[PDB]
Amino acid sequence: KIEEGKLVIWINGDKGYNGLAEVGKKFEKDTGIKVTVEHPDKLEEKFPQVAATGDGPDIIFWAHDRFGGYAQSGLLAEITPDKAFQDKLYPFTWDAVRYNGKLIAYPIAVEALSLIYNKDLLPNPPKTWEEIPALDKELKAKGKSALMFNLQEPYFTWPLIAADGGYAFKYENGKYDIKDVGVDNAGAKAGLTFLVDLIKNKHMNADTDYSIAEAAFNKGETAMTINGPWAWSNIDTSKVNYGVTVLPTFKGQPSKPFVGVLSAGINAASPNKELAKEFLENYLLTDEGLEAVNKDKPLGAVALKSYEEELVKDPRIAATMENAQKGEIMPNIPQMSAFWYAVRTAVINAASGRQTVDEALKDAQTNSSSRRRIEPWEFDVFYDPRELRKEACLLYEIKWGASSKIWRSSGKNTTNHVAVNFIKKFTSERDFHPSTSCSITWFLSWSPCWECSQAIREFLSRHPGVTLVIYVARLFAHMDQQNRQGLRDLVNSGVTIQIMRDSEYYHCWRNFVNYPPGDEAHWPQYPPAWMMLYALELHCIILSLPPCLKISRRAQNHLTAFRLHLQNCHYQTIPPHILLATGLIHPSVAWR
Amino acid sequence: KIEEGKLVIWINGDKGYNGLAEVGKKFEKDTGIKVTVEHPDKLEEKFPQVAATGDGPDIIFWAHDRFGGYAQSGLLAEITPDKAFQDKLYPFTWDAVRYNGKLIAYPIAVEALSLIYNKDLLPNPPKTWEEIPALDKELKAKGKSALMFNLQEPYFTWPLIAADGGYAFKYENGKYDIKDVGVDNAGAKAGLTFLVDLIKNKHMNADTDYSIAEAAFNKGETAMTINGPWAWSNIDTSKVNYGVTVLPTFKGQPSKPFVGVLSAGINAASPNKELAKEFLENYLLTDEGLEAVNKDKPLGAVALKSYEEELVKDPRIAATMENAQKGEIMPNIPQMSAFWYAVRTAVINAASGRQTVDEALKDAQTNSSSRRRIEPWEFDVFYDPRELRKEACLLYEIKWGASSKIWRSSGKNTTNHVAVNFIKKFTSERDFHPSTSCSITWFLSWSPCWECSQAIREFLSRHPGVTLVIYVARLFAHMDQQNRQGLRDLVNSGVTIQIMRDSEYYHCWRNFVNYPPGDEAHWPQYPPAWMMLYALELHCIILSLPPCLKISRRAQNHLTAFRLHLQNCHYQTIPPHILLATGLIHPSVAWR
Ligand SMILES: OC[C@H]1O[C@H](O[C@H]2[C@H](O)[C@@H](O)[C@@H](O)O[C@@H]2CO)[C@H](O)[C@@H](O)[C@@H]1O
Ligand SMILES: OC[C@H]1O[C@H](O[C@H]2[C@H](O)[C@@H](O)[C@@H](O)O[C@@H]2CO)[C@H](O)[C@@H](O)[C@@H]1O
Ligand SMILES: OC[C@H]1O[C@H](O[C@H]2[C@H](O)[C@@H](O)[C@@H](O)O[C@@H]2CO)[C@H](O)[C@@H](O)[C@@H]1O
Ligand SMILES: C[As](C)(=O)[O-]
Ligand SMILES: C[As](C)(=O)[O-]
Ligand SMILES: [Zn+2]
Ligand SMILES: [Zn+2]
């Protein structure tokens, strides 16, 4: 767990955890800090749950796709690599680890799927997918199956989908569109139908996973497979004459597999961020340590120019990099998460006889762009009476008096305050519903800033028929004259502002959180201390009164000082029920 | 709540409420302030219940015995009469209305019980109690009663108890001893035994109350009665030729009834202190006002020298004054309440035969200095939001392992920290209770101070076999090196100290508080903020840590400043469950 003077690292079990542990033991021999490497099941999903509470790993190794979402939730800490060390790595890798113009993780290596074929059972690999069935038949009469790969994860099935036009959040103008998804394109459907046909035609088993595929190829039972560099080690120990080459073409077009950038991020809650930076910049990302890691399980094209200079000489590395070039780099935006959850489901339903290709891809098309859901860990990270610097919070519920139906969704911090983002979405999409007489209800943790107050006021004056109500859980810089006037302005302009309470939190839990089936309505009872304190301060703001409480923090959640100063002014003008509700003052005497 | 610009007065229905109302009407005609007089049932007990909430009357008329307790609860306000006016009343009256060197009420008049006899049915009243049965027999042959008086209230039966040495509290120069009680004295036993004999011997009925007694005397059914001046009016309208004289002598000794000083106290919460002072000093305590009150229901000898000087000429007033002289001044200490509540029961149990005279007097003797059933209003005056320095909970429950019986009761401040009071009481009564095993459980308000800690440790060392557990609700001067080291000292000496929580308060409510009959097991749900805060500070104390929170008060319960300073030391050593329970910090920091 995150201990002082200790490093806890999490890396996928398929990679070189022992090699990384050896590098860590060298770090321990030099500085005296135990480096413990762990590989839990589906760490990409366990990491936020434990990092939010605080008991997690000091460093996390994984692709760059989920690092975006992590940094969005404020789980990763910014890395400061001087220009000398920054110039040591290729610019593509750094561009892959940059979120909102800020570096969030150290690039370790590049990984792309490649076609590994048994040179003994097949001297010349096939150049196209259409000839795979015939080949399979010819080898089935001999007692062996060909081209067996993991069908459980969409990362392996995506090359066929993208071969003829599979766009995942089309990119243009330097920005990735979330609404425009391509998993339902003609080419995507064609590729998935071909794979489903390969399964139906008895050429491939839908139950095949990474373990079964790798074991069958290592035992000479299969002539081909699709995998990255990590498998090369076990394949070498299998003494099977194999060859790594490019992936076959689908309908005369090159298969486009996503390019993953294995990177290491530093936990924002770990107090050993200095030790983490030292370990990753001085011992891991060097020819010595990176070579030791590569020794256990190969990691493909590395990010270090010093090592890559003589590592690209391996034809296997060259084939993987060629496949990556033919492919496209994986985006690191947060929505990617949902994207995969959708494709992974579609692929499964396409492998089984539950849904057709069109049905699965259409459901994935409509679910890849989802913002109607929110996880419980991130709910505790944003909607909580306790402070977290990364505001990034908005639960909006729009109701139209005409149809009397609630349309709910969320919003996060995208290089701009969420208020400005919702305003832009409302102004851009004119087809709301009848487009008039709408009641908007916001559930955000931090109070709108002065600039956001002016923007929301201009937006509300722009559209007359908008009944807007705001529920805030925390107060952003409640001791800034401008923020004060902004909140008073919003209230005076017809915007109700109230501090979230038990009712509001439970309502948000039921309507927005992706709570598990069993724990239905089991919302996390938050302490009323800060709820009542922020309510008292907010009422002092509305009454143009001086600040009563003063907070003094120093880190993401470190509270050093807290003071409550109630002047004669407060006792004389602030209503008594609020003071009595905070529980810190006496009732009968507050009234006298 | 208490109204502005209005005077509300509460006086017992047996006094001249109409006369007081007319004086208030004159005050209204002169200053334009409606003075409304009310007479609620059992106001001596209703007044504190409403005064704790703050609502109630502006002025209260009653004996000074209950004013001491009222003042200790912070319910009465200090009066500031000038010397010119103070010299208008008798000095000993002010002495009776003085509590802790401060005048808490305006003395109105003095009242003492007198023997009222029907001059037609009895020409010569009896001079001794021993001849009362004889007289009775004669009148029984006539179809009349000899002596019928209210025996439900101990105020009427006390003269016989004190006739041969019955004292409520011990009398010393400036020192009124609470522990030394004389309700178990030989003379007290003899007096109550004579009363019980009068009841058992068919000379008096044990169910006789004030109503039946007064009505029977006014209807010529009985030849004698015992009453004060207030009954004189109704007796005058009864057309019965009566006479007021001194009380008979028991065993050749004069009957000693407590003398009540009817006084008017000003509610400490009422915002009309000035109006109350004016009404009491300029219109009520004058010859005109006192005469207008005397016309309705006589008040006996008033405290005003101008009126009393020419009022003593009435033989009835002279007889009342003689009974008062031969009697004794009623103490105004708070414990008086319990005292009476004790005697009241004893007497009843002796009249109904449910308990013998010795049993009733012994129980009254043991429960006259304390009270085993605390009222809810005074229990509300004891809690953590109230910073009031005066009241000290001192709820103690002692079990004797030899019998597995629990002894429950309370105690108060009385010019000495409750610690030394309990030490002295236990050291004095050690011989009367069981032999060796003992486990004391304290539920007190303020954490023992430096001096109290040293006294407690020396008491615990003086008695080897004593297991003491302390549950405190607040922390007194938690920023004093001496108090700090004292608490640590008590802990190191084998004494457990913990901050009271919901469970402890519920236990105190169910076992010590006089729970309401209709509302059973409903303990007052109080906010936990200060409970958790004082708990965090207590842990900082025990762990020899620097002060964490700092309070800054300005009035009775006016909290002007409250600061929480959690240094790195605190975060590093304080247990995380306490910090997390306060609700002001994040679990991430607590976990680390
Ligand atoms: O949750 C499944 C996961 O699939 C992909 O993860 C890849 C990973 O990027 C590679 O480094 C390698 O380890 O194979 C994994 C599939 O087993 C996606 O990268 C990821 O977004 C997704 O969550
Ligand atoms: O959520 C992002 C987070 O970044 C920073 O968090 C780190 C930071 O690296 C440190 O300088 C220090 O301030 O606290 C954290 C690690 O101890 C910031 O705290 C803040 O911008 C933000 O919350
Ligand atoms: O403690 C019991 C109760 O007894 C006496 O009360 C008398 C009072 O003195 C009389 O003036 C009359 O008006 O009311 C009571 C008789 O029922 C004590 O004087 C009183 O203080 C005390 O509370
Ligand atoms: C989401 As904000 C920092 O504008 O309140
Ligand atoms: C601190 As104390 C008045 O209970 O001795
Ligand atoms: Zn903003
Ligand atoms: Zn003390």
mmCIF file of C-alpha atoms in Angstrom, chain A residues 326-542:
data_model
loop_
_atom_site.group_PDB
_atom_site.id
_atom_site.type_symbol
_atom_site.label_atom_id
_atom_site.label_comp_id
_atom_site.label_asym_id
_atom_site.label_seq_id
_atom_site.Cartn_x
_atom_site.Cartn_y
_atom_site.Cartn_z
ATOM 1 C CA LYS A 326 -0.154 0.623 -40.921
ATOM 2 C CA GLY A 327 -2.456 0.988 -37.911
ATOM 3 C CA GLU A 328 -3.425 4.069 -35.934
ATOM 4 C CA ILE A 329 -2.426 5.196 -32.443
ATOM 5 C CA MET A 330 -5.036 4.626 -29.731
ATOM 6 C CA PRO A 331 -6.585 7.836 -28.332
ATOM 7 C CA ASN A 332 -6.249 8.558 -24.612
ATOM 8 C CA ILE A 333 -9.573 10.371 -24.089
ATOM 9 C CA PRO A 334 -11.736 9.103 -21.183
ATOM 10 C CA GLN A 335 -14.702 8.010 -23.333
ATOM 11 C CA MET A 336 -12.369 5.313 -24.729
ATOM 12 C CA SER A 337 -13.249 3.262 -21.641
ATOM 13 C CA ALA A 338 -16.946 3.061 -22.526
ATOM 14 C CA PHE A 339 -15.873 2.519 -26.141
ATOM 15 C CA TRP A 340 -14.126 -0.726 -25.251
ATOM 16 C CA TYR A 341 -16.916 -1.863 -22.907
ATOM 17 C CA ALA A 342 -19.199 -1.556 -25.934
ATOM 18 C CA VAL A 343 -17.008 -3.204 -28.562
ATOM 19 C CA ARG A 344 -16.026 -5.987 -26.124
ATOM 20 C CA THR A 345 -19.728 -6.668 -25.642
ATOM 21 C CA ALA A 346 -20.603 -6.466 -29.340
ATOM 22 C CA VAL A 347 -17.794 -8.889 -30.260
ATOM 23 C CA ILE A 348 -18.975 -11.334 -27.581
ATOM 24 C CA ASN A 349 -22.601 -11.156 -28.760
ATOM 25 C CA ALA A 350 -21.343 -11.625 -32.326
ATOM 26 C CA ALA A 351 -19.354 -14.707 -31.359
ATOM 27 C CA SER A 352 -22.394 -16.231 -29.660
ATOM 28 C CA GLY A 353 -25.819 -16.703 -31.211
ATOM 29 C CA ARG A 354 -27.404 -14.096 -28.942
ATOM 30 C CA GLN A 355 -27.299 -11.112 -31.324
ATOM 31 C CA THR A 356 -26.591 -10.561 -35.006
ATOM 32 C CA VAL A 357 -23.662 -8.549 -36.341
ATOM 33 C CA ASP A 358 -25.801 -5.508 -37.128
ATOM 34 C CA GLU A 359 -27.538 -5.598 -33.732
ATOM 35 C CA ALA A 360 -24.301 -5.858 -31.749
ATOM 36 C CA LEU A 361 -22.567 -3.145 -33.775
ATOM 37 C CA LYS A 362 -25.603 -0.834 -33.583
ATOM 38 C CA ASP A 363 -25.748 -1.196 -29.807
ATOM 39 C CA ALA A 364 -22.017 -0.502 -29.677
ATOM 40 C CA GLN A 365 -22.507 2.514 -31.970
ATOM 41 C CA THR A 366 -25.120 3.951 -29.601
ATOM 42 C CA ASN A 367 -23.140 3.034 -26.451
ATOM 43 C CA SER A 368 -19.645 4.129 -27.540
ATOM 44 C CA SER A 369 -20.755 7.735 -27.010
ATOM 45 C CA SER A 370 -22.213 7.460 -23.516
ATOM 46 C CA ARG A 371 -22.356 10.063 -20.771
ATOM 47 C CA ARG A 372 -25.619 8.795 -19.171
ATOM 48 C CA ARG A 373 -23.559 6.744 -16.696
ATOM 49 C CA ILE A 374 -21.040 7.438 -13.912
ATOM 50 C CA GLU A 375 -19.039 5.032 -11.712
ATOM 51 C CA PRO A 376 -19.178 4.997 -7.890
ATOM 52 C CA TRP A 377 -15.450 5.558 -7.390
ATOM 53 C CA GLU A 378 -15.519 8.670 -9.566
ATOM 54 C CA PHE A 379 -18.739 9.659 -7.806
ATOM 55 C CA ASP A 380 -16.826 9.686 -4.519
ATOM 56 C CA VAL A 381 -13.962 11.503 -6.240
ATOM 57 C CA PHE A 382 -16.171 14.383 -7.431
ATOM 58 C CA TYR A 383 -19.421 14.432 -5.387
ATOM 59 C CA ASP A 384 -18.147 14.393 -1.815
ATOM 60 C CA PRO A 385 -18.155 16.960 1.012
ATOM 61 C CA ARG A 386 -14.385 16.525 1.289
ATOM 62 C CA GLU A 387 -12.048 18.526 -0.925
ATOM 63 C CA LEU A 388 -10.267 17.338 -4.090
ATOM 64 C CA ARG A 389 -8.481 19.879 -6.289
ATOM 65 C CA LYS A 390 -9.681 18.393 -9.594
ATOM 66 C CA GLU A 391 -13.200 19.828 -9.648
ATOM 67 C CA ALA A 392 -14.403 18.115 -12.868
ATOM 68 C CA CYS A 393 -18.016 17.567 -11.840
ATOM 69 C CA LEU A 394 -21.493 17.990 -13.326
ATOM 70 C CA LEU A 395 -24.709 15.926 -13.248
ATOM 71 C CA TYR A 396 -27.320 17.665 -15.389
ATOM 72 C CA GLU A 397 -31.012 16.788 -15.582
ATOM 73 C CA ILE A 398 -33.129 18.627 -18.186
ATOM 74 C CA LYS A 399 -36.931 18.414 -18.089
ATOM 75 C CA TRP A 400 -39.318 19.658 -20.780
ATOM 76 C CA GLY A 401 -42.723 20.825 -19.588
ATOM 77 C CA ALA A 402 -44.177 19.684 -22.909
ATOM 78 C CA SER A 403 -43.253 15.992 -22.574
ATOM 79 C CA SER A 404 -42.597 15.995 -18.779
ATOM 80 C CA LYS A 405 -39.701 13.534 -19.178
ATOM 81 C CA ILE A 406 -36.249 13.831 -17.602
ATOM 82 C CA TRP A 407 -33.130 13.646 -19.789
ATOM 83 C CA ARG A 408 -30.126 13.027 -17.550
ATOM 84 C CA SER A 409 -26.386 12.944 -18.255
ATOM 85 C CA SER A 410 -23.042 14.213 -16.937
ATOM 86 C CA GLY A 411 -20.119 16.457 -17.808
ATOM 87 C CA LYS A 412 -16.457 16.622 -16.859
ATOM 88 C CA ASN A 413 -13.548 19.086 -16.855
ATOM 89 C CA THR A 414 -12.374 19.356 -20.483
ATOM 90 C CA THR A 415 -9.665 22.092 -20.412
ATOM 91 C CA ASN A 416 -12.561 24.439 -19.538
ATOM 92 C CA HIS A 417 -15.008 24.729 -16.701
ATOM 93 C CA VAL A 418 -17.854 22.249 -17.090
ATOM 94 C CA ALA A 419 -20.325 25.147 -17.046
ATOM 95 C CA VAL A 420 -18.892 26.524 -20.292
ATOM 96 C CA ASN A 421 -18.978 23.032 -21.772
ATOM 97 C CA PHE A 422 -22.682 22.546 -21.016
ATOM 98 C CA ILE A 423 -23.431 26.035 -22.347
ATOM 99 C CA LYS A 424 -21.685 25.197 -25.623
ATOM 100 C CA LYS A 425 -23.536 21.886 -25.955
ATOM 101 C CA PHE A 426 -26.889 23.602 -25.384
ATOM 102 C CA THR A 427 -26.132 26.438 -27.830
ATOM 103 C CA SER A 428 -24.753 24.125 -30.539
ATOM 104 C CA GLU A 429 -27.498 21.480 -30.447
ATOM 105 C CA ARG A 430 -30.689 23.448 -31.128
ATOM 106 C CA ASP A 431 -32.839 20.289 -31.341
ATOM 107 C CA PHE A 432 -33.334 19.782 -27.610
ATOM 108 C CA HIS A 433 -37.048 18.965 -27.742
ATOM 109 C CA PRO A 434 -39.595 21.696 -28.505
ATOM 110 C CA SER A 435 -36.531 23.897 -27.592
ATOM 111 C CA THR A 436 -38.435 26.104 -25.117
ATOM 112 C CA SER A 437 -39.700 25.917 -21.521
ATOM 113 C CA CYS A 438 -37.012 23.664 -20.064
ATOM 114 C CA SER A 439 -36.117 23.142 -16.391
ATOM 115 C CA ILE A 440 -32.395 22.435 -15.960
ATOM 116 C CA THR A 441 -31.120 21.002 -12.670
ATOM 117 C CA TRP A 442 -27.369 20.923 -12.024
ATOM 118 C CA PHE A 443 -25.643 18.718 -9.446
ATOM 119 C CA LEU A 444 -22.000 19.781 -9.213
ATOM 120 C CA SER A 445 -19.546 19.699 -6.331
ATOM 121 C CA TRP A 446 -17.749 23.039 -6.677
ATOM 122 C CA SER A 447 -19.523 26.388 -6.832
ATOM 123 C CA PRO A 448 -19.261 28.234 -10.174
ATOM 124 C CA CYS A 449 -16.389 30.696 -10.407
ATOM 125 C CA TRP A 450 -16.876 34.372 -11.263
ATOM 126 C CA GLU A 451 -16.161 33.791 -14.960
ATOM 127 C CA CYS A 452 -18.469 30.783 -15.051
ATOM 128 C CA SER A 453 -21.099 32.865 -13.295
ATOM 129 C CA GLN A 454 -20.874 35.526 -15.989
ATOM 130 C CA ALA A 455 -21.002 32.919 -18.770
ATOM 131 C CA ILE A 456 -24.004 31.114 -17.274
ATOM 132 C CA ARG A 457 -25.752 34.443 -16.689
ATOM 133 C CA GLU A 458 -25.209 35.452 -20.313
ATOM 134 C CA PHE A 459 -26.481 32.052 -21.452
ATOM 135 C CA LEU A 460 -29.567 32.276 -19.241
ATOM 136 C CA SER A 461 -30.327 35.770 -20.518
ATOM 137 C CA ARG A 462 -29.783 34.473 -24.056
ATOM 138 C CA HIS A 463 -32.501 31.833 -23.674
ATOM 139 C CA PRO A 464 -35.422 33.281 -21.657
ATOM 140 C CA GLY A 465 -37.432 30.120 -21.014
ATOM 141 C CA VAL A 466 -34.903 28.222 -18.872
ATOM 142 C CA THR A 467 -35.654 27.485 -15.201
ATOM 143 C CA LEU A 468 -32.190 26.654 -13.847
ATOM 144 C CA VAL A 469 -31.473 25.325 -10.331
ATOM 145 C CA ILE A 470 -27.989 24.557 -8.966
ATOM 146 C CA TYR A 471 -26.997 22.146 -6.170
ATOM 147 C CA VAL A 472 -23.339 22.437 -5.135
ATOM 148 C CA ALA A 473 -21.471 20.144 -2.752
ATOM 149 C CA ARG A 474 -18.389 22.330 -2.126
ATOM 150 C CA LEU A 475 -17.392 25.981 -2.467
ATOM 151 C CA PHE A 476 -14.606 27.086 -4.799
ATOM 152 C CA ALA A 477 -12.541 29.951 -3.329
ATOM 153 C CA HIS A 478 -15.384 31.095 -1.083
ATOM 154 C CA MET A 479 -13.116 33.951 0.086
ATOM 155 C CA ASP A 480 -12.754 35.713 -3.272
ATOM 156 C CA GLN A 481 -14.749 38.915 -3.700
ATOM 157 C CA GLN A 482 -15.328 38.133 -7.383
ATOM 158 C CA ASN A 483 -16.622 34.608 -6.760
ATOM 159 C CA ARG A 484 -18.843 36.071 -4.035
ATOM 160 C CA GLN A 485 -20.377 38.607 -6.402
ATOM 161 C CA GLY A 486 -20.751 35.905 -9.038
ATOM 162 C CA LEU A 487 -22.794 33.668 -6.749
ATOM 163 C CA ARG A 488 -24.888 36.616 -5.555
ATOM 164 C CA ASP A 489 -25.369 37.602 -9.196
ATOM 165 C CA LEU A 490 -26.629 34.149 -10.121
ATOM 166 C CA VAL A 491 -29.049 34.119 -7.191
ATOM 167 C CA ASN A 492 -30.298 37.645 -7.917
ATOM 168 C CA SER A 493 -30.743 36.791 -11.617
ATOM 169 C CA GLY A 494 -33.158 33.937 -10.868
ATOM 170 C CA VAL A 495 -30.899 30.921 -10.195
ATOM 171 C CA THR A 496 -31.518 28.968 -6.998
ATOM 172 C CA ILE A 497 -28.298 27.750 -5.373
ATOM 173 C CA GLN A 498 -28.325 25.229 -2.523
ATOM 174 C CA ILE A 499 -25.761 22.983 -0.852
ATOM 175 C CA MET A 500 -26.220 19.268 -1.472
ATOM 176 C CA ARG A 501 -27.649 17.232 1.396
ATOM 177 C CA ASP A 502 -28.612 13.601 2.058
ATOM 178 C CA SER A 503 -31.609 13.848 -0.291
ATOM 179 C CA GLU A 504 -29.578 15.288 -3.176
ATOM 180 C CA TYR A 505 -26.752 12.757 -2.808
ATOM 181 C CA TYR A 506 -29.172 9.812 -2.711
ATOM 182 C CA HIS A 507 -31.051 11.215 -5.720
ATOM 183 C CA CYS A 508 -27.813 11.505 -7.694
ATOM 184 C CA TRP A 509 -26.819 7.987 -6.612
ATOM 185 C CA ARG A 510 -30.062 6.507 -7.933
ATOM 186 C CA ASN A 511 -30.398 8.520 -11.144
ATOM 187 C CA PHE A 512 -26.754 8.805 -12.291
ATOM 188 C CA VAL A 513 -24.352 6.398 -10.538
ATOM 189 C CA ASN A 514 -23.627 2.996 -12.088
ATOM 190 C CA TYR A 515 -24.308 1.283 -8.804
ATOM 191 C CA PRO A 516 -24.213 -2.550 -8.734
ATOM 192 C CA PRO A 517 -27.500 -4.511 -8.699
ATOM 193 C CA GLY A 518 -27.369 -5.748 -5.100
ATOM 194 C CA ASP A 519 -26.364 -2.471 -3.437
ATOM 195 C CA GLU A 520 -29.392 -0.641 -4.823
ATOM 196 C CA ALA A 521 -30.199 2.561 -2.881
ATOM 197 C CA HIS A 522 -27.214 1.801 -0.582
ATOM 198 C CA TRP A 523 -25.791 5.238 -1.049
ATOM 199 C CA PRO A 524 -22.644 6.154 0.923
ATOM 200 C CA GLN A 525 -23.786 8.209 3.919
ATOM 201 C CA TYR A 526 -21.469 11.213 3.927
ATOM 202 C CA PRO A 527 -20.712 13.110 7.158
ATOM 203 C CA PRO A 528 -22.958 16.178 7.490
ATOM 204 C CA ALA A 529 -20.125 18.325 8.916
ATOM 205 C CA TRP A 530 -18.935 19.881 5.653
ATOM 206 C CA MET A 531 -22.428 19.859 4.152
ATOM 207 C CA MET A 532 -23.737 22.072 6.943
ATOM 208 C CA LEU A 533 -20.544 24.166 6.996
ATOM 209 C CA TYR A 534 -20.717 24.952 3.282
ATOM 210 C CA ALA A 535 -24.439 25.660 3.693
ATOM 211 C CA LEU A 536 -23.718 28.207 6.412
ATOM 212 C CA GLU A 537 -20.971 29.828 4.353
ATOM 213 C CA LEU A 538 -23.188 29.949 1.257
ATOM 214 C CA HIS A 539 -25.938 31.650 3.222
ATOM 215 C CA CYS A 540 -23.322 34.134 4.456
ATOM 216 C CA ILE A 541 -22.447 34.717 0.810
ATOM 217 C CA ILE A 542 -26.061 35.384 -0.165
#
